[PDB]
Amino acid sequence: MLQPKRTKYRKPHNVSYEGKAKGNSYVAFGEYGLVATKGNWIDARAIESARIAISKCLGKTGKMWIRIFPHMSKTKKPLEVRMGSGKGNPEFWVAVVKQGTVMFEVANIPESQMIKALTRAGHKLPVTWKILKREE
Amino acid sequence: AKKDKAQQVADVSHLLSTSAGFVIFDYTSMSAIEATSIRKKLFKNGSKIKVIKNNILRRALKAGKFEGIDETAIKGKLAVAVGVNEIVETLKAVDGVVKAKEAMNFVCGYFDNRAFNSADLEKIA
Amino acid sequence: IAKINLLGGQAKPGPALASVGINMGEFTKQFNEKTKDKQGEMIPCVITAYNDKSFDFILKTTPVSILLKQAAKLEKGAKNAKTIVGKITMAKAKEIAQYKLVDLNANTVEAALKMVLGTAKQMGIEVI
Amino acid sequence: MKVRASVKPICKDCKIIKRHQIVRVICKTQKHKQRQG
RNA sequence: UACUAAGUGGAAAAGGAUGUGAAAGUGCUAAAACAGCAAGGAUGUUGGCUUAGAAGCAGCCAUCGUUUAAAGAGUGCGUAA
Numbered sequence: 001m002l003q004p005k006r007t008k009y010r011k012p013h014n015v016s017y018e019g020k021a022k023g024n025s026y027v028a029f030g031e032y033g034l035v036a037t038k039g040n041w042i043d044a045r046a047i048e049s050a051r052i053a054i055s056k057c058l059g060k061t062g063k064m065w066i067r068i069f070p071h072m073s074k075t076k077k078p079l080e081v082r083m084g085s086g087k088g089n090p091e092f093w094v095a096v097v098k099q100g101t102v103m104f105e106v107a108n109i110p111e112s113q114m115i116k117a118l119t120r121a122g123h124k125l126p127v128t129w130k131i132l133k134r135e136e
Numbered sequence: 137a138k139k140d141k142a143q144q145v146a147d148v149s150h151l152l153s154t155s156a157g158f159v160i161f162d163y164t165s166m167s168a169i170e171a172t173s174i175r176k177k178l179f180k181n182g183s184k185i186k187v188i189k190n191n192i193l194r195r196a197l198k199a200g201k202f203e204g205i206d207e208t209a210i211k212g213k214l215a216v217a218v219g220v221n222e223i224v225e226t227l228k229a230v231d232g233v234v235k236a237k238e239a240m241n242f243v244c245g246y247f248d249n250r251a252f253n254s255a256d257l258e259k260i261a
Numbered sequence: 262i263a264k265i266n267l268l269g270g271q272a273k274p275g276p277a278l279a280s281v282g283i284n285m286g287e288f289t290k291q292f293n294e295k296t297k298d299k300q301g302e303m304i305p306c307v308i309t310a311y312n313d314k315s316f317d318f319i320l321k322t323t324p325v326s327i328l329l330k331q332a333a334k335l336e337k338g339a340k341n342a343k344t345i346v347g348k349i350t351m352a353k354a355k356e357i358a359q360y361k362l363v364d365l366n367a368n369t370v371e372a373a374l375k376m377v378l379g380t381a382k383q384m385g386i387e388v389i
Numbered sequence: 390m391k392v393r394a395s396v397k398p399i400c401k402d403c404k405i406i407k408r409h410q411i412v413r414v415i416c417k418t419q420k421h422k423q424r425q426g
Numbered sequence: 427u428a429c430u431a432a433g434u435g436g437a438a439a440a441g442g443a444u445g446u447g448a449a450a451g452u453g454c455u456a457a458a459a460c461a462g463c464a465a466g467g468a469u470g471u472u473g474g475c476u477u478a479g480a481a482g483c484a485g486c487c488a489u490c491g492u493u494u495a496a497a498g499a500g501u502g503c504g505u506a507a
């Protein structure tokens with residue numbers, strides 16, 4: 001579970017996922033990458049599921065990079081509570097994924113395992129994923 | 137590619153031009169263990185069994201300015217058994233082996249700038 | 262056709278043969294008669310199982326890579342291919358090749374030479 | 390027969406067909422019959 | 427002038443599919459293409475640890491080499507093996 005060690009403000013305003021791609025747009029560490037086609041809020045739980053999926057379907061020498069990180073937190077008012085009396089408490093951490101951000105990349109193992117590995121990582125995420133390669 | 141095919145047809149045509157005896161066989165029901173046995177029993181560089189393409193064999197035959205072998209290489213499975221110097225002992229050896237086999241056909245061949253029939257192959261041994 | 266495993270000094274048992282109709286008791290003498298030159302060594306037999314009943318049998322050489330162990334002066338080879346322990350020269354390799362030429366289907370003796378390297382690479386023995 | 394929202398071949402022998410405007414998977418092994426693709 | 431065969435039109439997602447049309451590249455082909463059919467489809471050997479046993483198809487030590495058109499320490503089934 002990726003989580004910031006400390007934050008200046010417990011309850012920040014939510015960060016929109018509507019828009020184009022700011023950074024993390026092109027594969028630059030590996031050479032195959034999992035691009036998104038639909039901006040959405042995905043939490044650290046989905047990252048851990050996807051990362052564990054990649055590691056289980058990886059080999060003995062494959063290497064991976066996680067680009068996105070859940071910087072922003074979100075709150076949730078307790079159940080059966082009427083509106084008012086302040087904002088709720090932080091519950092889960094979410095990374096802001098915009099349309100076009102490369103979430104996972106893999107390298108150093110043959111192409112078929114890498115294509116399969118990215119597929120299982122993207123089935124764990126709500127965004128509509130797509131495979132891309134690194135420019136020569 | 138085309139250049140390799142051109143090279144292949146040229147060298148097989150040269151080999152059949154400098155050779156003296158040829159006989160055609162089929163590849164129906166004999167084992168690879170048996171195939172290695174035929175190679176060792178011959179053991180002569182003049183005698184050589186080879187799988188040739190039907191198309192490549194006819195085209196090399198056109199370059200060999202021979203005639204009449206066309207009926208052999210039509211709608212059939214073709215082997216090449218080239219013999220240098222003495223070919224009677226090679227034909228005798230292959231005839232003994234097909235008798236030791238279960239079933240076999242045997243198609244007309246070419247030797248001494250003359251052609252033979254099926255019965256003429258039976259007596260050529 | 263059956264490739265059956267029978268000891269050279271003890272080949273009288275074996276019920277599987279009896280299922281095909283082979284005359285086991287008459288043929289026991291034939292099994293033991295031509296293996297006394299290699300007593301103690303384990304020698305399997307190929308059987309031309311058929312209904313003619315005149316079953317022609319052929320003996321067979323003990324499996325390879327045990328003389329490699331004997332020549333390498335070690336009991337068991339390395340558990341890692343990269344790790345090299347045994348070394349074998351061309352003279353020991355060629356004695357094995359002319360020994361094993363009988364069971365091999367190679368036409369030439371250099372083909373049998375590079376058989377020794379091929380099983381030695383599996384065994385991990387450097388070819389020097 | 391297994392009714393699933395997604396149908397894919399299980400073994401290399403499974404073959405996808407489209408019968409009565411419905412895609413199904415047929416194979417020698419009857420444990421691998423799928424429908425409602 | 428084209429497209430759709432779903433009454434889609436005339437409500438929906440993640441996911442799945444030899445539905446169909448258009449386009450842009452690349453491989454082979456009348457020196458014969460692809461599918462199917464007819465044949466072969468190997469030897470050391472059943473390599474060796476290993477496992478009651480595996481030895482073409484348990485984990486391995488790896489992932490051999492020749493003959494040859496081709497053949498794999500095998501494609502599965504399968505055999506205690």
Ligand SMILES: [Mg+2]
Binds near residue numbers: 436
């Ligand atoms: Mg409707």
Ligand SMILES: [Mg+2]
Binds near residue numbers: 443
């Ligand atoms: Mg489709």
Ligand SMILES: [Mg+2]
């Ligand atoms: Mg289309």
Ligand SMILES: [Zn+2]
Binds near residue numbers: 400403417
């Ligand atoms: Zn199936």
